[PDB]
Amino acid sequence: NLFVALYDFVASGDNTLSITKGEKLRVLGYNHNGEWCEAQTKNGQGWVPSTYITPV
Numbered sequence: 001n002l003f004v005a006l007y008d009f010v011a012s013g014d015n016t017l018s019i020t021k022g023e024k025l026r027v028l029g030y031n032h033n034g035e036w037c038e039a040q041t042k043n044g045q046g047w048v049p050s051t052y053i054t055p056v
Contacts, residue, residue, distance in 0.1 A: 001027050003039070004056040009048050017046030025053055 003025040011018040017039060019025065025039040030050060037050045 002056055003027050003037075003053045005048075005053055007052050009052045011046065015046045017041065017044055017048055019048050019052065024056065027053070 005019040005021050005023045005025060008021050009016075009019050019039070019041060023041055025041050025048070028038045028040065028045075030037055031047070035050055036047045037053060039045065039048050039053065
């Protein structure tokens, strides 16, 4: 379950996480609708838009 960021996402907060394009993430889960993904990166853990990431 390794993923890569498709775009930069600036953390809006409410447990969201900033990711940079090209960065590697490890996904833990999705929220109720699957629009949001709980991810871990070298900088932390938190929610990111599901559509801003892809497997690698």
